[model samples]
Target chain A: MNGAIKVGAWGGNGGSAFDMGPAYRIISVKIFSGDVVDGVDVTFTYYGKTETRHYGGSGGTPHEIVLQEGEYLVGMAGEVANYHGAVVLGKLGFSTNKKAYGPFGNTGGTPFSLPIAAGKISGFFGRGGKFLDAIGVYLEPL
Target chain B: AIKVGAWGGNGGSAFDMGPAYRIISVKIFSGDVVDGVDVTFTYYGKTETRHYGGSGGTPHEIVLQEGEYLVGMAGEVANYHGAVVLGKLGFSTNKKAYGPFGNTGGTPFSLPIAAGKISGFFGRGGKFLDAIGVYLEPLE
Candidate 1:
């Protein structure tokens, strides 16, 4: 089998699951919080600080994207009273946001079918305090 | 308490991976399928000691099926040649003298069930049920 072996960074709309590869390298990740009002930067302060820092839309069970033949590091936040962590390939997570997840954390449900690529937990943060959101990055083979 | 041997305490079936303890709550950061499973658990200060009836110095090949009720001794026992005390435990993948859930029985005791899936009969006081308290995921 012949393929590329390089590390590249990719981006997608917030809350949108991105597809990773079979022979790539994920170098960096960034979460865009420009959509949420007053949500300045993606901060994880509210994770252990307060409840529902914003008005209605809140963070919930993230997503479970499956992998094709690549590797990646999936990041998740807003659960367990505001917990954040990375679920590498072959692992799973539970995000409970109503707007994005609805009934959240159901392995057989929607938003839970996203496959994962091989990678590592690069970055993460929580509510109110920092105003920063969680983001993930996928690396492509060079 | 009860001589439950060295295990993960009482949940449904306790699975011990040695040097690591798994509590109720679980979290996996990353993994690679049946090839590798990311297992994480809480480790409190707990321990156990199990004794199987040994006879004639014959190394009883402990057996077990893949499920929560049984366990295996170790896959890489030879890897612990030195520098570590290799006292292993596990659920049998086949029938043995001890109840399928008891101690290692004298025999090769192999099961048709694939690894990770517990199957087999420990002749002694073993119970046949679909309930598995612990399980092992083989690595490639």
Candidate 2:
């Protein structure tokens, strides 16, 4: 097993989707975009299956989710517009065995696909403002 | 109201990057020209906005940066919704200048930060049909 998976500075507007290469058991997610006006709703998809999770609100905090291994697509949505100061922001900490190293900056906008490398991790920007609605995610091998 | 010059898209890609030039104005046409139902130009900044349609002039020059502008309809259309397209405006230098019409069939698009030719989405709503009619230009 590698170290802990840490992602940062990667986020998007409402209905923005992200792909987590091969998946593993999840640990927890830290929501930085406030609650109520800036909460986030996430939908996890994997192996022709899917599940939903709710996090961050007017007065909420980080939570945990445990999932199985496979390919995954996580779509995120906020309570309001995903602009400079009005969007959902957070980090994902998961446990995986595949070697990875990101949160690198990228230009691939929302509804983007992540080609996670076994031993590499890169950051990305959402479709909105430059460096504005920035959030983060991490990929680690189990 | 900021006044700019008139430039056309002769059809080409690959623009040369150099000294930065701001967009002064923008004009709109209904179909590939100065035709329109209602047009508005939203400059991406702190709090600046412009509307040019229903009763405005042509070659409206407006800008803050190359990719820091948004062009949309004033009124709601059937398919286009309340928005139509957004892009990294355009550029102009001594030889030529590109017009801000790299239509990205969606709002809040990030313009190219690089000093080169750029391309983006084109269509109505969130549905990107194809590449837009864009070009490179000389900064004047």
Candidate 3:
């Protein structure tokens, strides 16, 4: 079987599951931000074609990323903290085969990074709405 | 032999690979509250670590001994703003114990079980470790 496992939705559980499905590799991501992670739009290669999926709402500033031909996303580090009275996404950052994009958004609560026993990152998914309710990643066997 | 204490807030569900593998080590970063955590597991011969929550705070590590396994844990959880988060945590293993780490004031929880019976743990988290629950089973 294709060894791809879904990992987490480490944010709030305010929205439904928003999946970008599976991709050969992620091409780019536009992080919607403000006091918290408003949402994210990911552009990736799905079945040899470019596809884009937007999760969350249209609030906050947009931080975009476009990958080079051979560049692929490798690691992600993000923060989850109390904003207002709810737990929301904070500084979210990315690392690729070549360099790291660092982190974006607010920083207050706890911080978490991604590391798995196995599998390489494939694409992205999780729960969301106008705000990024939660976020998780797809892992394909390395 | 049983699992116990999945205490904290409810953000999203997270857990281990399977009941067949054994926990190797746990890495934690925290301050007055738990910032985040990453746990390593090994099965057959393959070893891996899965990260949960965010990063910030002082880092701490919990390594296991040969023939040793997790039994239970002692920790606490409380509300950060409006969302509840994991506070302090201490591991109780067959060989010894570790932690009581993080800020130790909040809703407290304790689960010290029979030796070699604790399998793994589960719960939910986002930025701060929201909650944790253990897995239980007998080992050969």
Candidate 4:
């Protein structure tokens, strides 16, 4: 892409469409889970303004990840699992300028991942409801 | 057009895009150091990129802004494993500066054009991007 590209909204084809607008830099991220990825939350600078966006409903355990100054997301990996009878996010993890974070959630279903690159993650998007039904990302080439 | 650099070792093969061309993108393969590079450009009405350097490191693609052009450049070069190599590189366009694509910590090399664009490239490379240089097209 000249600047960024939208790629992959993996999981079951359900739930309302969700997006965390354009992000200048991610300050922190949270993954909610139990046996499946219940939700996702992020605190970031929205084109220089501080903002927070989240998906999913009240449930599961929350795991927080705070980034260091000058750090940003580079890549990600996760899975989709069938919970009860609905397809939802099974697990999630992230790679940053410095290190890699968790693949939280109990894990199952088909695995999904992107090649680690120098590109920066600009925002997160997908579908969600009581649980994360799908997930995708916007990547800005470096 | 102005010349910037051909930093790094004296070994490897040489390449030049001459005085006619507009750069579009530079694909870099890097890891602790830059291993290789491929430049896609429009030259004499043809667009193509020849692979240069070794097979190592992860791929990183850098695309220029829409209708924008490259203007300046910066990098770090040093004796890499006893042979001079392009350890790191960064480029600029009218809109923004892209990156220091490879790893850092080496001899600094940079060029900031007053009013122009990077029109072409020249360098020596084979097993690794041994060196790099640019041809500037003055705005005036």
Candidate 5:
């Protein structure tokens, strides 16, 4: 799919938090789904705490969760159906510092590695084998 | 006739004509730039060096003519066995094709039929790098 708008964290408020003193933090977790669908539930873990949210609207939006600068694990819960594809479906990959990591799905709380200092994480997710869902998380300073 | 430079007196001939090719960007793979891993690319007979890890470690940007050329590295083999990408401007293609090296992965390698920009990653060993690629644009 050359330019299918591969679903991802594009045009979202996802990524890293600004430098508070030495370490950075995660200011918000923005989720985006390419396909027009109902609500999608997303769970993100930061600083050993987890929060589940429901995005009931189209387009992209963010959740305000001030997290201490570090690597946080985030994903979609299985119970939250209606997970449609915006681009291609295969793996949930994350991009940081121009590098991509993982095809994470059904990962069952498996925390993928992402650097907090890196600021933003853009990646895609695979679900229907021919569809995609992408997102971007912005890490702002405290 | 343009005598760009030489490698330890290993005189490599240069082709005439005001350089039509340019070095857009360079990406080091496997690891960061080490001791003296340098890159030398020749196009239209003009050869230039882009160093890694030391002083001129990966020059910012350059412009040159389009034609056949060779891109190689010089320095400690151990630290230099990584990918070296050279982004070029003046490259025209009828269709998308592979550059000097095969498409390692996750790099925009399709070339337009008209004069356009393209980036090629030269992987040293069998390993790959963290998609550190460059943007190719027409010579302004």
Candidate 6:
């Protein structure tokens, strides 16, 4: 199954007066799976450069890559793998004070794991039995 | 039997305020039967413009009006089922069953003889269907 993955920010981050537009910097992306932890593929448009990444169930430090600027389709082995809902786009602010993943971050913590059931991923992120696949972070212009 | 799928050009970008997409749209199609197969597809996209109200980034935010804003789009054929038997192949010849087969989902849960790649059963056979259908929304 393939398609020109079309996506955009819902509204954006904006306080009463201070409004920080689209957080181009992605913090983290979590993956979840049901069937099995087979393979994974992710492609996206960044800085006019198209990059594709592939992964298997070898078990290693779930990688975290940085994105330039554009849209992207983070693919996984199964629909259930990406069942984590909207994989959080760009990070919130420019300050690393509040990282993108963690107790104060956007995408991190607890092995960044996916819960698997008897066979299928029981939960994702912190739900139950689900496989966590890929995680990506965007740029943070200094 | 024919199956079709589409993928956005590499380096995905908003149709609006883009640096310019190398290749706008992309799609794939296929067909299979007991002893034969048929398939085909195509893609098209329009350029978009944007406004930078006030920014710090060179490739600034692609500002759009409150109303209409055009983004990228793609399509593909899915779960023909009866339609495959009628259209691509010369099987049933049923007029009503000549397009995308809506859905099958009952209980027998079997690949229909004419079901397309993207199953219409539980929302499978359709253009732009993805294992992980990325719904890129705003920062929530």
Which structure among the candidates has the greatest lDDT? 4
Cα deviation of A123 in candidate 6 (Å)? 21
TM-score of each: 0.18, 0.26, 0.53, 0.51, 0.27, 0.20
- Estimate, for each residue in B1-140, the C-alpha lDDT of model 1 and write its tens digit: 00111211121222234323322211111111001112233346653322211211223233222323322321111111121111222333334323122222121111111222221111111111111122222222
Clashes of 6: 51
- Candidate 1 lDDT at A70 equals 42
State the lDDT at A113 in candidate 3: 56
Q: After superposition, how far is residue B43 of candidate 4 from its true place, in Å?
A: 7.7
Per-residue alpha-carbon lDDT of model 2 for A78-115, expressed as tens digits? 11233344453332222333322222222223322222
For residues A13-78, what per-residue lDDT tens digits would candidate 1 score against the true structure?
A: 133232232322223222222222112111122224521112112333222332224433432322
Docking class of 1: incorrect
lDDT of 6 by residue, A63-96 (tens): 2323334422222111111223422211111112
What's the distance in Å from true for residue A80, model 6?
1.2
Summed backbone clashes in each candidate are 73, 53, 10, 1, 35, 51
> Which residue segments of model 1 deviate by more than 4 Å?
A1-17, A34-76, A79-142, B1-15, B18-140
lDDT of 4 by residue, B69-126 (tens): 8766777776777788888888777788877888845766555443456676778887
> Candidate 6 docking category?
incorrect
TM-score of candidate 5 versus the correct structure, residues matched by position: 0.27
- Please give me the DockQ of candidate 6 compared with the native complex: 0.03
Grade the docking of candidate 4.
Answer: incorrect
TM-score of each candidate's B chain against the true B chain: 0.20, 0.22, 0.85, 0.88, 0.24, 0.14
Q: Which rank order by TM-score, best down to worst?
A: 3, 4, 5, 2, 6, 1
Writing each residue's lDDT as its tens digit, candidate 6 over B27-73 gives 12222311111111112355432221111111211222233222221
Q: What is the per-residue lDDT of model 2 for residues B46-114, given as tens digits with 9 covering 90 to 100?
A: 222233222322344433355443322111111232322222234343234545433322322122211
lDDT at B55 for candidate 1?
A: 18
As for lDDT, the candidate ahead, 1 or 4, is: 4
What's the lDDT for all of these models?
Answer: 0.22, 0.29, 0.69, 0.74, 0.27, 0.21
**Number of the candidate with higher TM-score, 1 or 2:** 2
